[PDB]
A paper describes a structure:
Small Heat Shock Proteins (sHSPs) are ATP-independent chaperones which prevent irreversible protein aggregation by binding to misfolded substrate proteins. Most sHSPs exist as large oligomers which undergo drastic rearrangement or dissociation into dimers upon activation during stress, in order to execute their chaperone function. Aggregation Suppressing Protein A (AgsA), an sHSP from the pathogenic bacterium Salmonella enterica has been reported to form dynamic oligomers. In line with the current understanding of sHSP structure and function, our results show that in vivo, the wild type protein exists in an equilibrium between two oligomeric states: 18-mer and 24-mer.
Numbering used by the authors:
A (entry chain B), B (entry chain A), C (entry chain B), D (entry chain A), E (entry chain B), F (entry chain A), ...: 40 to 145
Amino acid sequence: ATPAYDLQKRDANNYLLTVSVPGWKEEELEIETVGGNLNITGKHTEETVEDQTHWIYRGIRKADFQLSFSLPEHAKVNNAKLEQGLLLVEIYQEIPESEKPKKIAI
Amino acid sequence: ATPAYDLQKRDANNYLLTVSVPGWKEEELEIETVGGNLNITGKHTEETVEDQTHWIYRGIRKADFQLSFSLPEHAKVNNAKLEQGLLLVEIYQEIPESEKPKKIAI
Amino acid sequence: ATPAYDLQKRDANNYLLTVSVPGWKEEELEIETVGGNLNITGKHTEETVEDQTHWIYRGIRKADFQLSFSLPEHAKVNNAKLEQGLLLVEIYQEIPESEKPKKIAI
Amino acid sequence: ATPAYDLQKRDANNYLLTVSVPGWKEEELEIETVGGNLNITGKHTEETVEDQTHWIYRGIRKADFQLSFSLPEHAKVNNAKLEQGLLLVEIYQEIPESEKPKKIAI
Amino acid sequence: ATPAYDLQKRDANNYLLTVSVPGWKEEELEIETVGGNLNITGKHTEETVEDQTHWIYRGIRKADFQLSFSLPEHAKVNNAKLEQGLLLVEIYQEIPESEKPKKIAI
Amino acid sequence: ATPAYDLQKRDANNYLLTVSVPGWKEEELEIETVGGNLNITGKHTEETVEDQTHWIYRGIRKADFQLSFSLPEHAKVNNAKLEQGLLLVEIYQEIPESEKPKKIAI
Amino acid sequence: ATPAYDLQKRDANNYLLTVSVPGWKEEELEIETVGGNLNITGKHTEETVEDQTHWIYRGIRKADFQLSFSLPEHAKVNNAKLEQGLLLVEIYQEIPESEKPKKIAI
Amino acid sequence: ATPAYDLQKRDANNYLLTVSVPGWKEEELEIETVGGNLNITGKHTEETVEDQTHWIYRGIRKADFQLSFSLPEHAKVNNAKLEQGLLLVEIYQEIPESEKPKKIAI
Amino acid sequence: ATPAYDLQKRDANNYLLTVSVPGWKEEELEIETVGGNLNITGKHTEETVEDQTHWIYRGIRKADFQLSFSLPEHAKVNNAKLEQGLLLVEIYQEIPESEKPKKIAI
Amino acid sequence: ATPAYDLQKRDANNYLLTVSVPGWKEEELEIETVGGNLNITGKHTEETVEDQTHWIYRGIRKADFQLSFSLPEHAKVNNAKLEQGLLLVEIYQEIPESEKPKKIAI
Amino acid sequence: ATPAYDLQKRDANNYLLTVSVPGWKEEELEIETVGGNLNITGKHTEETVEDQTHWIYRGIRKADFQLSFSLPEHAKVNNAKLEQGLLLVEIYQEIPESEKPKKIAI
Amino acid sequence: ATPAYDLQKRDANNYLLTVSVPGWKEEELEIETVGGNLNITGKHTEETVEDQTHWIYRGIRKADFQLSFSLPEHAKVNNAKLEQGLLLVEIYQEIPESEKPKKIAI
Amino acid sequence: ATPAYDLQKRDANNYLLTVSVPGWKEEELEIETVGGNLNITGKHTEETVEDQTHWIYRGIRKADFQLSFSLPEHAKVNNAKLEQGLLLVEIYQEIPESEKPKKIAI
Amino acid sequence: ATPAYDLQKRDANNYLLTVSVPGWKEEELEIETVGGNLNITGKHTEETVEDQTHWIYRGIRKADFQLSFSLPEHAKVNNAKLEQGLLLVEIYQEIPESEKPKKIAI
Amino acid sequence: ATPAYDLQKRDANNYLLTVSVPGWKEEELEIETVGGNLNITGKHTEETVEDQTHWIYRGIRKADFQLSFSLPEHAKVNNAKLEQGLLLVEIYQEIPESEKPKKIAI
Amino acid sequence: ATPAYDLQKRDANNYLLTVSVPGWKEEELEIETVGGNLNITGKHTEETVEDQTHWIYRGIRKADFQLSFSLPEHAKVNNAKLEQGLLLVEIYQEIPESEKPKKIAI
Amino acid sequence: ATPAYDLQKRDANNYLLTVSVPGWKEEELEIETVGGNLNITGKHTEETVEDQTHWIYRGIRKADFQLSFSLPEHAKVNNAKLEQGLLLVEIYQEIPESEKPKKIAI
Amino acid sequence: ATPAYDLQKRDANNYLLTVSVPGWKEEELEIETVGGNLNITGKHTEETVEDQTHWIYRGIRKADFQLSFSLPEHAKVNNAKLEQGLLLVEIYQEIPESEKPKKIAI
Amino acid sequence: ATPAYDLQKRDANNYLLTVSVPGWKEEELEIETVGGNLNITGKHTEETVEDQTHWIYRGIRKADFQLSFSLPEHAKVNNAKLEQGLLLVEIYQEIPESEKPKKIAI
């Protein structure tokens, strides 16, 4: 079971990844950039004896996980903010020497 | 698409509801108490046309919704607190003048 | 075959039932409130020799029927109007001593 | 979803169409005579956003529509009268100078 | 269940319809010519309490019915005779200004 | 293809057979009493070649046939009358010196 | 749907038929002995407008019916009593000149 | 095998149960009122070994049984009368101080 | 595998049985009339070492057999001739005191 | 489970029934002659509770039973002898004054 | 339907064909020798209309037919004899100057 | 089995029918013009009994037949010529005073 | 494979056909009005050796074709313009002496 | 996997629950009465390294569990004894003001 | 698709092949006798641009083809005539020194 | 097909085999003890021409057979008696030096 | 239904059987040692008729039974102790003078 | 629904894309060059509500869309010309300094 | 999942077992000889937190296990060497007093 995720392009220079991580905390998330690939890794730090007597129902599941995504050379990350249960990660890279849309003919 | 939810019962007089609500603004959320029944209604306040060309992938779902639960008399809500995209709703009550958890004989 | 029917809530104090009854007349409909249940009953008063020679096609069917619906204690009916082939029945009851929607926390 | 309809023929020169149209306003309805063909077009003039939370149940359908029938020459419409949600449309004509319904021999 | 029926052409000017109507009587059959169509209609005039104690077996069924057949303009009926359980109806019309079969070539 | 048939029993000593025989000439029909058994044999006396081009439709069937029924001793035939294409055959007998239809006690 | 029925032999001279006929009355049942066969016939004498409003549920069905059973020559009926919803019919006949069970050998 | 049963409701305060119980002796029958619930228990008091050689056919079933129904407060039984193998049980009650069966408006 | 057989009626007094018995001989066939039943019995008298080397193909099979047929009282056999591989057996009995075919009515 | 049985016919006047009845005591067996019909009824007189722990295997079946056969008039039983667990029952009769087993012609 | 046939080979120079032909007249039969091939053609000379009412059963088949067999050079027919409904056809030939059936060594 | 047919249209006023009719004699063929409809009726004038022994193979079919086509007013037949087993039938007409095949604009 | 096509009504006097014909040229399209029917016909004028070496992929197919559509009497074509790969054909006809939509009653 | 369980009624005032709990100990079982519901909860207190080398086979499984059962108001528990691997729990409540079974009528 | 074909034997000396070849011409058919085999070969000499605009329907297909048939040594062809769309080819060969049909025996 | 068989233990020292062998005789059964295995062998000594004419029906089958059963060392047979179609064989062996059932603990 | 069982082996000379036996009285239980084989036979000493009306639910099964296990020589039983519904049976033995669990080399 | 497209490659340095875009306005079309990738995005600028009553048929599809293709370095677009509803897009490039198409040896 | 294993016979006195145990160590393997059976037992001594971040892929699985094999009396083990991931175990036993292969005859 993996957390929901989206990717948008702010521009040719921009990728933005949005991941749903409810209950996920500052200490619980660690990320690494290795060999042109970005890895986003969740870990539940520890277990708590959960009284199955205490809870009648659970529909919400979280699991430790790692996500891997190949990054185009040569990429730079702008910011990562966790707000409203959302992980927003800003990533910058560009200059293929073509941003330019143009034509018309007849 | 409906949000996953967990419900905890702390004691004979109290249970706790846990709802995953990522990306949701308090401004998007409304709650109602009617006839001993709790209705939780999410409303996305407004939408913005986004060019799907700019969005490469969407795994994350957004929808307006309503949930309903009949609560036994006589109910009072303690707190509903939103943190890191989760809604925790405190519910405390009971009085049938019996809590008593004991016996064995022979 | 039963007539189409809808139910809306004007407020906690209000239920509104809308039933489609084309061709249904003042004398043809009788309703009764018994044991906390509302019964809406149609009866075709009588038969008319119908010349099957006279009509080539019929798509519209009506049948004698009774509808039964359990009413929450302790209910009162406001009005019932038959207009434009519609049966509109206004029903009032309330005061669980909770109309009140409220909360926010953090 | 299309409305059930009945068609009656009173005589060699006359038939009658019966349409179920509950909740419909005359203001919502348009009829057209074109090329010996009758077109009956319902149009819901406008809609109102209704919160489905307020509506518990809908069995009753609402839609804009058009119906078409080629009518043999030479047709004239007598009346279309709307009562208790039904549309009765009067159609009278024929002249092939032959009505004659009789014979037997041996 | 409909009675057996046949159609023969005596000539370009002639159609002959033969229908099996055992037990069918002078009063029981009525026919009508309307709008270029011929209708042949059976009616059992009435019911007779039939003692199901009186009859052990029945293989022969009769039912009230109407038959409709589009007639080419401009048609005239010659005779209808009921004999030996047979309905024979003679119908005349002609003069397309071609009765004429002819050719040979090489 | 065999003709539909009905059999009526008027009393302990009498039953009546009803046969549908449209288009049949008495000249086409033969009956036989052999060994307490009744044999009803239809024979179409002769056929005429008809050009199927002149006949557009045939729903009506014509065939030679024989029917057989063992009748309990001691049988005598009263009448067989042909009217409007139906054959009614009268059969009267019995003598086990017992007709008696009655009793109840307690 | 036919009423439950049983047959027992009191002796070589005796048959006893037991039929369940709840709600069946003195006037409602008529029996006849004809041609060595016994017929037991129920008839509901008449209909009563039954208010389908008056009854919510019926599991018990009764229908008009006739039962026929071939009787060995030469049979005599002793008694028929209706008691506790039961139809008991006593029937006597005998004397094949063998009642006699006997043998042993070696 | 359980007995067919019918239930009639004579009025807002009264309903009637109809049970088919052929061959049953009052001595075989027991009824019980416990917690607002009616239990109807048939008990065949005793059995007699019957030689199945003497019994040629059994269509009629015999079994001990119990039936249960929760009855809304506050119930009182009027009569249970056994006639011609049927048990009719009278049940009368209600008091929510509302019988009122009327309205229409416009 | 049984030999082909046919039965014809020469008259009410006559039955004729024809059985195919190729290779069947005078000594090989024996018949018996017992208890109103006729039995026709074939027996291959003996075996002959058959050289399976001598014959490449056989399509014709014969087997020892017995045929049994219930004869109406009180029957007499006229003649049995074996000719051209055919068994022809003539059987006479009659006089139900009905040979007589007759009727016509109207 | 019913016993295998063989039936032999020694002559036109006599047939012999062979029944396998191992472990059966003559004391367990009863025979009856009723209405020209033979009934053979085995009855195990009594059973003894046997501990299935002491019995490792049972392939052999034991049951009470009744068999029935209609015998044509006029029947007399000669002998029924039980030897080495088999019941042989002698049956001799006939007199239609015809035994005659012969003819052939040409 | 084709007749069963057997073929026997008496020696290297001779084989024998056996055909079942019951009811066949020599007058019905024709044989032909063409191109070293034998053709056996049965022809039923003529038919007689038989009333199927007089014939109760037919198991025996009658049809005209032709059979063909290529025979190796150089063939001569010895005899074809018809007895008790069987056709035996004698065929003798061969000369490849080799009959010799022997050897073994080591 | 019906003959393959081709239909050619030479112009707005003319179409040509092509029928394959091998082995057919003009003497076998009849054509008819009735009510603006063309009927083409083949009739094999007579048949000759052919011994199927003389015929080794038949792939070629022979049957009497009729074909029908409604032709729009106002039709005249030009020629029907039979050559090398094909029937070519010339049909010329039209006059709605419009042939005109042209336009394009911008 | 046929080109996409649409039909709209500008009024009772108007039909407009829109066909997609990319790559279709002035010389390539020819239309004809014959017998009340309009035919729109494409023809690729000629072939060009297409180097299958020159093109790696083709998703767009064009084929020679003809479209036929029955035109109501008595029709006139206004204009046909090929613009933006679109064929727009304007067609006029009218005057059934009914353009008139009207009614309301009660 | 849950332990086997039974429920008996000693009287209107009595329920008795019997649960099979082999190996279950004094410390291992805890029960609680909360909100009109009784919960019976097993817990294995701890784990013991089980040598899978030590045991070749186990057919008996025990698991930690909780059972929940809604109790009618207003209930009292008498005794709970663990004997012979059985959990017996006595529960008392009553006085609907009907213990009373009674009736007979006619 | 191959043309229909038949083969008949005029005598032992004769084969006759009949092939349907409508539209097939003098120049279009060529035949060859090679190695004891006869080959009949059709060729459409050439193609004609066929206006698919000119013909609405074709049911008749012709294709170039070759037929091959092994001829018994030593064969001679008499005549080949194309008449009425028929190819008739006369072929002679004989003298196996057996034309002779003969036998009868007993 | 093998005869029914049972095995019981009279004690640790005892096995008893019971086999059903109806019609089986003193001379017909031979048994042998070989290599610790007991073999029970039936043989029908000889055949008797059985007239299939003499018997109409046989349900009882017997076949020659041998049964083999491994015997525990070191076994001794007590007695074998054939009575009432039963083969009873007494077999003794024992002394594992444990006959002894005992224990109780706590 | 057979009881779940576990078997433990404490050492080379000893294994332990664990049986679940809830509700069982020692008085109900019997054990036997025969031929090195252990037989455990439960016997419910007697039953009491319980009214299933008093018993609302039964999940718990009660049956008499026997279990068998061949035990290798030379076996002795240590103890069988019943506690909290479990039977633990101690079995100790072996002497093949080899326990030795060790080696490794290279 | 996506538009059919063809792609042509004129030479090692050049390929041509062919897109079908009927009814499309240049004003509706946008193209983009990003990261060596070509994106072709159609956008219908705006829509007009059309009454589907006026439109009898739609086979022609209209939708906004985006297409994407990674183009190998180093790409430059020559022309994109729209004619008669087709978009032809010119793409020229390559320089791996190798075009050479030749050799053969031996 | 169990490790691959092979068994070879060096001679009548010899068995050799070869087991694949990659990664298996001196401390990890323990074997025991008990009751004529050899047990080979693997145990992973302990767990190591394995970083699932550290390893992307594993195809090689090892599990704790025990193997059991019945040894013929009276067996002796020679050597066990772990080399190249192989477990080689030498086992000796012999002297059935037959090693001897011999024979030829005629």
